[PDB]
C-alpha cells in the first residue's frame, strides 16, 4: 500500500531497525514513530524492520 524510496544511506543500530542504502525501495507495512516507519524492501522481503523517514522519501506523490 505505502511505498518509500530510500534517498539516503542509513544503518540500523539494533535488530529492530532496517538498514537501507540510497536506491532501495521499501514497502511500508507499519508505523512506529512519526519519523520511524516499518516495512520491507520491495524486491528483498527478507530485509524488514523499522526505518527513519528522514532518510527515505514517501512514494505517494
Amino acid at each position: 500500500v505505502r511505498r518509500v524510496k530510500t534517498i539516503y544511506d542509513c544503518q540500523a543500530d539494533n535488530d529492530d531497525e532496517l538498514t537501507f542504502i540510497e536506491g532501495e525501495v521499501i514497502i511500508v507495512t507499519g508505523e512506529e514513530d512519526q519519523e520511524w516507519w516499518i516495512g520491507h524492501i520491495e524486491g528483498q522481503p527478507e530485509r524488514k524492520g523499522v526505518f527513519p523517514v528522514s532518510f527515505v522519501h514517501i512514494l505517494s506523490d
Partner: peptide, 19 residues
C-alpha cells in the same frame, strides 16, 4: 541520487535503548 546532504538519525523515540 543522494538527496541533499545526509540527515540525522533522529533516534527512534518509540524504542528505548535496552541496557
Amino acid at each position: 541520487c543522494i538527496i541533499s546532504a545526509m540527515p540525522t538519525k533522529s533516534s527512534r523515540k518509540a524504542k528505548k535503548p535496552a541496557q
